[PDB]
A = this chain, B = another copy of it.
Amino acid sequence: YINDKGKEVLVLWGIHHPSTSADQQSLYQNADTYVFVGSSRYSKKFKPEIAIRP
């Protein structure tokens, strides 16, 4: 997305960490995945941490 709007644009997103390998595949098939948000200033590669939390 290019920001053409006059002002600055606030963008939110999420990174989903699944309980188990069982549903990592139910949800996205690939077991090893990554997300990469990029931008002129920002820039981070995320990798989902698969484990069972309370």
Chain A positions within 8 Å of B, measured between CB atoms, are: 36, 38-40, 43-45, 49, 51-54
Which applies to chain A's interface (DSSP): helix, strand, loop or mixed?
loop
Q: Is the CB of A36 within 8 A of B54?
A: no
C-alpha gap A1/B46 in the complex (Å): 29
Q: A30 to nearest B CB, angstroms?
A: 17
For A53, give its contact among B43, B51, B52 (CB under 8 Å): B43
Question: What 10 new A-B contacts, CB under 8 Å, besides A36-B51, A38-B51, A39-B53?
Answer: A36-B49, A38-B52, A38-B53, A38-B54, A39-B54, A40-B54, A43-B53, A44-B49, A45-B49, A45-B51
C-alpha gap A52/B54 in the complex (Å): 36
